[PDB]
Amino acid sequence: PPPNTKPINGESPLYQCDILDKQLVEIKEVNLDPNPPVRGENLTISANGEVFETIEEGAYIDVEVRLGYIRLLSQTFDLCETLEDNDIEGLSCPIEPGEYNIKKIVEIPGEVPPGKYVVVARAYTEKDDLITCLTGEVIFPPRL
Ligand SMILES: CC(C)[C@@H](C)/C=C/[C@@H](C)[C@H]1CC[C@H]2C3=CC=C4C[C@@H](O)CC[C@]4(C)[C@H]3CC[C@]12C
Ligand SMILES: *[C@@H]1O[C@H](CO)[C@@H](O)[C@H](O)[C@H]1NC(C)=O
Structure with a gap:
């Protein structure tokens, strides 16, 4: 994978990107x-990470999904509102520094077209400090 990248330990395709930029959160394992x-099945996500600065209301995530060279989805999300909506282990948004472990189940839709998808997410704080950068490639087998 591209420059300024490090693999994330664990059973996952994720890499940490923009590694030469200090990040307020470390994703130790996924x-x-x-x-x-x-596709069409549950996905259980387990993650181990560390938070070095309190993340406050107003943080946001830029998420980009790309299919080949096509910019499929590109938009920003309210980090706190999004975490609160998807019930990630009752984590209220004021995320204090410390050791975290997360377990979340999501449903991967079966209608997703087959292909090589690349996901990139960058989370920033309200004053725009980089929280974290994650990238991953997921190939769905061509049985449409
Ligand atoms: C952790 C990552 C690497 C794993 C879970 C893979 C990502 C999946 C869930 C992503 C890859 C492409 C994404 C995707 C492609 C196309 C569409 C159609 C659009 O109208 C709504 C969003 C939607 C439905 C999203 C849903 C989430 C998908 C299917
Ligand atoms: C998928 O997840 C839903 C809710 O998380 C659960 O009710 C269902 O039993 C799960 N099914 C499988 C096959 O894991």
Whole structure:
């Protein structure tokens, strides 16, 4: 994978990107229950990380999904509102420094077209300090 990248330990395709930029959160480990995610099935996400600065209301995530060279989805999300909506282990947004472990189950839709998808997410704080940068490639087998 590209420059300024480091693999994330665990059963996952994720890499940390922009590694030469200090990040307020370290993602130490990530594990996916069906290791290559499968369409139409549950996906269990387990993650171990560290928070070095309090993340406050107003943080946001830039998420980009790309299919080949096509910019499929590109938008920003309210970090706190998004975490609060998806019930990630009751984590209220004021995320204090410390040791975290997360377990979340999401559903991968079966209608997703087959292909090589690349995901990139950058989370920043309200004054725009880089929280973290993650990238990953997921190939869904061509049975449409
Ligand atoms: C952790 C990552 C690497 C794993 C889970 C893979 C990402 C999946 C879930 C991503 C890859 C492409 C994404 C994707 C492609 C196309 C569409 C159609 C659009 O109208 C709504 C979003 C939607 C439905 C999203 C849903 C989430 C998908 C299917
Ligand atoms: C998928 O997840 C839903 C809710 O998380 C659960 O009710 C269902 O039993 C799960 N099914 C499988 C096959 O894991």
